Symmetry: C3
Subunit: 572 residues, 3 copies
Amino acid sequence: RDRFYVCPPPSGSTVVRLEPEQACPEYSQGRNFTEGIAVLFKENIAPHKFKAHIYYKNVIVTTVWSGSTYAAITNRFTDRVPVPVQEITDVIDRRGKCVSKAEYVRNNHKVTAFDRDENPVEVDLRPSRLNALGTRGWHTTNDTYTKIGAAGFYHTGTSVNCIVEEVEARSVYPYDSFALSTGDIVYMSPFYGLREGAHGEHIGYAPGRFQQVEHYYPIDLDSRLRASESVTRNFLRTPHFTVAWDWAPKTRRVCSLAKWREAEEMIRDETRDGSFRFTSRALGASFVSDVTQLDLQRVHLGDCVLREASEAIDAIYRRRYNNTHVLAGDKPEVYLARGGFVVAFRPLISNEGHLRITTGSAEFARLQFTYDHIQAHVNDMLSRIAAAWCELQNKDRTLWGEMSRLNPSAVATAALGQRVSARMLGDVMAISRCVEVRGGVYVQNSMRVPGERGTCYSRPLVTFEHNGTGVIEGQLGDDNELLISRDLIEPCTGNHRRYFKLGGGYVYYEDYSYVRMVEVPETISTRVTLNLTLLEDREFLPLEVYTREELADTGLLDYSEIQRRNQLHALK
Amino acid sequence: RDRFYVCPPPSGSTVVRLEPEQACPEYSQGRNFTEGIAVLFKENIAPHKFKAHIYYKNVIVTTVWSGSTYAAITNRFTDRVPVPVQEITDVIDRRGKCVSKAEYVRNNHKVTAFDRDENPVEVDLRPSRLNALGTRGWHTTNDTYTKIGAAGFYHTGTSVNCIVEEVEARSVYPYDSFALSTGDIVYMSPFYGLREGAHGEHIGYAPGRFQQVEHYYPIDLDSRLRASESVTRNFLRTPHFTVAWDWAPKTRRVCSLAKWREAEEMIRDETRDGSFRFTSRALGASFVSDVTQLDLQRVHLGDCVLREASEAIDAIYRRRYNNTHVLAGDKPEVYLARGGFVVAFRPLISNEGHLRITTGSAEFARLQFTYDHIQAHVNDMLSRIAAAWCELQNKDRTLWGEMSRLNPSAVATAALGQRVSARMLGDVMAISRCVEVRGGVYVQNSMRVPGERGTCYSRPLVTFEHNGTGVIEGQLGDDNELLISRDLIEPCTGNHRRYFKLGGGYVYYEDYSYVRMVEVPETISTRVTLNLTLLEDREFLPLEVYTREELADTGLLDYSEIQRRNQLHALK
Amino acid sequence: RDRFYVCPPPSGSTVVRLEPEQACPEYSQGRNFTEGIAVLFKENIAPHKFKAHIYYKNVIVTTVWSGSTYAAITNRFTDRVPVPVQEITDVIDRRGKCVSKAEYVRNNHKVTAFDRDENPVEVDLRPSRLNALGTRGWHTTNDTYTKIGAAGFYHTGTSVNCIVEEVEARSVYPYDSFALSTGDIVYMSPFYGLREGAHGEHIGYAPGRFQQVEHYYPIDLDSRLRASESVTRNFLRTPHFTVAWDWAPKTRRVCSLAKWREAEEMIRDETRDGSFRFTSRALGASFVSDVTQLDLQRVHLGDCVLREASEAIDAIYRRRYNNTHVLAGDKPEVYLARGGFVVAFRPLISNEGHLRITTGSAEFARLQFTYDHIQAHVNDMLSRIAAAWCELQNKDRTLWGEMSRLNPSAVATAALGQRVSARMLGDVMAISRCVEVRGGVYVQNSMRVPGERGTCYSRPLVTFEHNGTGVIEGQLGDDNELLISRDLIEPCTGNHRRYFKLGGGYVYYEDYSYVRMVEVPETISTRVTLNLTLLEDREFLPLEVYTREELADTGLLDYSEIQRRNQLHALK
């Protein structure tokens, strides 16, 4: 049951016009780009690894007690002993042998020891047995001298094993000490020398123990050779051994940074208060930096950057671009991106202080990229929709001005969302409200004009009442509008069926006479449908591949769990 | 070649009306928020670190054999020995000296030893040499006594070094034992005492070894001092040394949780079956919890939470809000978020059991946030589009009712997507189909009415055939509709050019006479364009900064790789 | 101030028509799916852990010097010694005792030792004390024999402790050696045997040391038992102990892969150059693989896959699907997904070479999923919008053809975006431009026709000038169009107010006479509004829960930091 309406004639009391076309939203100028090739450098967490050699003699003095039926070991004193630098160069290198005696200082006292307690003779250096992921080694003896029995007392045997070993060395920042595959820590920089500016490294020893030998040629101790190309060799004489390694300039062996990824399709994009954004589609990562370059000089040991960067970058240019684009500037540009990454970037042109800790994750970089990508897209495509909508609104207004001629009251009603009565005062609209009536309205069976044959009424005659208890003669208009003056008249026609609107239902008229009240179960739609649905809630539960527990348990031995045990020998 | 159509007069057989305006989709009420300040706590994986002191005497009994030309070490027996608590307090503390003799029990036998094998005299405690990231230490001697020669036999020397060392201590959960910078594991809780409820900690020793000293004043052993403010000192007497550290209540030194991040702009939002969602724009993370608070009491050692939370939160309130907002409640609220994070949250008001394992990642938290953010946006803006579309469909229907007067057949055709013939029965539409004809249709050169001068035909005369082999006289209507009755007549005019539609092409008429068949290569469009493009496939390849291999190799020494080696002395 | 326009009569010089309806964009066929159940397998980084037993005798030979007032330990030589296999089986197993003497070879010499230096008697194996997370153990003695004094010389004591220990064993890839809870590395495969194809494992020993005992029954050494079900027992005789463990086939104990996650709602989807995409809503991860299955045979030790996969999968089918769906094929399908994950997938049907390194992250998998999800949605819903827009443009054209009858010039102007003059030549449009005039245009006070009473002019009379200095008589049209011929005439009416458009403002006329120049501050809009807003910039700052620093510091002891210290005994 929808309302009935009487529409008083619109006087020029209120005058309105049709809202004119509006200015339609523009987009943005489209971001400025800079194509190019970039290399990403992380903080170098890796230790410095070099090869080295150990020379030590293996002093074991065992004392046995022989008796009636048995022999028993009362003692076994092992101790390692340093082979002198000359003994290395003049005997082990030159001849491949080693003196079977070790004259060393222990407890600030010059002492000695003899293999088999016999006389000092030079012995051949034989290889070891072998392996299970183990390096090279050499020794002089296969056994350790002990006591020849004859029941009675305690004889004390003395063996001496001359050992040369290939060992892998390891120094971590700041490299003022290193360590050997054998567990032994050397309290000095592997870059210490006597050269230009080496002397300025760290030594934890008396300078007599340290000694450098230039133009050394590293003899290989199996199948001999020297061979080509000489080395400056470092010798350190410790209380328990001697170590020899190849000295080289610090600045050339280690870097604080380390090449991580290359990016052939790298894109830089500046927006807002000075901020570059390096993004790689291949990687799937975005890197926000400043616009100011990194003064690479403010980095302790960062020379490998420009080196290895110029290298890779050029390698790719040869490999992908050299017939289409050209390098920009001479050197590549260098920026400190967020999260401790270093970006060396050289732009592509078509022929037409403190040190950095890299987060062990670049998760932000990819979350950036991903959001930055979608955001870009939906913003573009929604701006396109916003623009078309306005253009469509702009064009549709030509249809509405035309209709405000034939029917300015219907226009005005739609626009205002309420039933108004309107009509044109030339180029403008005069407007008034519409007042409700009750359901107490009655229709008449006759539509034929009494006073005249031939001319009938077009639309039904009604007697509607101001309230629900009166009478006024008028006729029916469109959309339940009750008119007053009864001058909607047409000539009579044969074959005359008519339907008219009344509240909710309709009314039928055959041959200008009332008949019945109809339904309208049949409809017709000019509507274009648009079923959008919502994006659903998702639940991101914690997903780790490896927990930290598992990550620690990977090792064969746990030094904490073993000391934890071996101590409890308040026991077994 | 599109079709021709004959449209039989629409009788009231089928009656339809124009589908009325529809109810337009509303949005959601807009989510309810709760601004505020939050602190995030992770599971504390860090060990408990305290300072401590070691007191031990260094017993080395060496035996030498002197001879003709040499001396040789036959043995060297080192062993560490505990300094008694009284010797600490009465000699080392009080005087700064140490007895050069060590009376200890070994093999369940009271034994002793003398430095230089001489008489017990009190010796000054001198500092050590120094450093390379090494703490403080003290000793009494710089050398170790050995044998004075005179060729002949085996003399046995005995040295004793009194050593006090500053050591860094480390206890991990559940702290029922700790360990020292020197490698030594103490099988007891660092919180064990004799106080109120300490006695209930773990000891792996006989109570005689343990001893507490209240109102101790920690003398500093270089440049002396006691000094201000006393300590309850713990003394443990081990077989190889004595350790002294500061006892303090367990509940006050360690927590199971640990402050991770603060969030000044934290937002909580409840939706669906009881679920809060803490999100920080700064962080870039979302944290789903329950609505029930965490009973912090069900956590073993979780007191640092409310402490350090109330601290930071307040610090920020002073720093950002105290003139605009106000704290809510008294205490902050506490929730267990997904992934083992603890959220202490105190809302902002404008003046107007078991323990937790924190995932070593919060990746879910940020993936949540990111999806939760976009989803929010596209859902809003697509609902806005959906709403406007319906409102636009609602308003456009006023244009379609108007047109169903001038031309109800064109309306009805568009709506139904097929060629229908329709016309108004008052307020309703009567509808019929349209039937095809063949291409075998012919046009006539004349458009002039024969029977009358002055009046011509408006639209061309055609003789169309029901099939492709007949004849019926009719004339041409719009859009290739073939009419029947030939009464589309107008007065004749000079300057008369006309084009009419025929299949695909058109037909020209000059001065009411046939001429030729034209093309129409010129078009005009009322269309608003909308070029949307699709979002492209992206490929997220695995991107790790550091592999686990590199992550293990960071250490200077690998206890597994060294034992792996030292054992192979089935060798060198 | 907008322009005035004169519109020359449109001749047939330019003829155009209204652009016809266009073909509307279709969607895609909707992707093809394959529901099912999947299990995810990662690379197994875990070591192989088995139980084992150690048998060794504890030889400590101490030598004391007794004197006047004291006794002093001059030496203490500990050494571990292997218990023979027969002694294990015939004494320790059978009887639960152990001979108080150890006949071992040391320095390639058969030697012996006696507890208390007395005669060999069999002694009972007692339990140890206990614990602090420590396993079982047994020994024979609680003390170590030393010297009975009587002042004078150096007596040498000899104790021997028989020890059996329960130890936890650990082998890592490739398991050609293992290690014990006690720190001891055994250089041999735990799967070595003498069986079919075991003999082919690694041994670093002489075969005499190795010995296998079939149908062994593992006696438990406290409260005895054998008991049920026999074992093939391995015995290795090392220089310092004996180890016994249970041999079993290698292929059955270890796998190179390891079950990680299960997925009940797993979805596979093929698109483009052969690529599956396994996605789980629960997990929140997507896994791109090839279409070719993984030949599981090309994997060293990958048998646990099909085992444990068929297990879980079936368990779930019973648990969720068995009344709705059915398994597909017999065996499950197996694919190598990106990032080193293995996917075993068995489809669901409604009743109707080299080895793999798994990245310690699956971050790509979830970033994939997340982007892949949104991309899917916005692409769908934007295609829906694109489709409706075209359908709406298609239907609206029926309104524009109707209007090109009543007003073809207004249509043509909107469409062309410029002021044109047009009119119908039957079924086609003739078109011309419109030429500007100046603001120098004048309106006349009179609207009454002089020559006739009764008939007035409808729209104002103007004298507009080609330039800004002429005269031509015409009248005013719509939208500031200046006409020429003055034949817009109507009968005169009482109650006559009129507004007309002039540049920007309007002009009022009462009773067919000029009055004033009005404003139009009242407007009316047929516009549907659409306020879209943009998605805002987000900043993803680096967010780590635990830095690698913290991750290393978790351990009680650092073997690198302790050796680092203990060495500096160039000191204290």
